[PDB]
Scaffold this active site. Sequence first.
Site, PDB file in Angstrom:
ATOM      1  CD  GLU A  11      -2.977  -1.492   0.429  1.00  0.00           C
ATOM      2  OE1 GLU A  11      -3.241  -0.177  -0.369  1.00  0.00           O
ATOM      3  OE2 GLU A  11      -3.393  -2.037   0.368  1.00  0.00           O
ATOM      4  CG  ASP A  20      -8.405   3.176  -4.486  1.00  0.00           C
ATOM      5  OD1 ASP A  20      -9.043   3.221  -5.555  1.00  0.00           O
ATOM      6  OD2 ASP A  20      -9.016   2.410  -3.461  1.00  0.00           O
ATOM      7  CG  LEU A  32     -11.447   3.193   0.329  1.00  0.00           C
ATOM      8  CD1 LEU A  32     -12.947   2.657   0.260  1.00  0.00           C
ATOM      9  CD2 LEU A  32     -11.530   4.599  -0.122  1.00  0.00           C
ATOM     10  CG  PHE A 104      -5.597  -3.848   4.724  1.00  0.00           C
ATOM     11  CD1 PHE A 104      -5.239  -3.107   3.671  1.00  0.00           C
ATOM     12  CD2 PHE A 104      -5.463  -3.515   6.067  1.00  0.00           C
ATOM     13  CE1 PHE A 104      -4.979  -1.963   3.769  1.00  0.00           C
ATOM     14  CE2 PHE A 104      -4.813  -2.068   6.193  1.00  0.00           C
ATOM     15  CZ  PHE A 104      -4.659  -1.357   5.108  1.00  0.00           C
ATOM     16  CB  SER A 117      -9.791 -19.067  -4.487  1.00  0.00           C
ATOM     17  OG  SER A 117     -10.825 -17.921  -4.804  1.00  0.00           O
ATOM     18  CG  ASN A 132     -10.605 -19.962  -8.583  1.00  0.00           C
ATOM     19  OD1 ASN A 132     -10.790 -18.992  -7.697  1.00  0.00           O
ATOM     20  ND2 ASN A 132     -11.513 -20.287  -9.332  1.00  0.00           N
TER      21      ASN A 132
END
Length: 162
Positions: A11, A20, A32, A104, A117, A132
Amino acid sequence: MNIFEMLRIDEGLRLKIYKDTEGYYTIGIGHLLTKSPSLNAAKSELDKAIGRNTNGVITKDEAEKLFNQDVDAAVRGILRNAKLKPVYDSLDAVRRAALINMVFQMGETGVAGFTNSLRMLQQKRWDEMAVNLAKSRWYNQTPNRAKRVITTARTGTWDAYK
Ligand SMILES: [Cl-]
Ligand SMILES: [Cl-]
């Protein structure tokens, strides 16, 4: 290497409101702010978040504070979730970090949705799970970050981050 160092790499760290990769207002370490096309609405959320009139600029310490809160929310989100919890419990410490990273980044509801998955994950079908997860918007949108998390999930090692 730990979950904190892992997300800090993925990040980055910004002390000023930013957008973003999807156009969203973010700050600090991947926090966010809002999905709203309004900068004022973002400065609002930020001040409410931080406890003060930030005029859109926070300190490193303040970013770390949000970050601590966000990793904690990710972990609690996983443990309280009926779909995520068993996958989590079934895994090793490295692979666990990878799930937390995905939560996250994408939220508990989003990851919980990866039905297939999560099942490959739980069943330890590592290679198949990696193939996948790659078939997804997530990977297409942020391919370099995705490859590192998917590799961490696949191998159970921190190679991709070293
Ligand atoms: Cl918050
Ligand atoms: Cl990327």
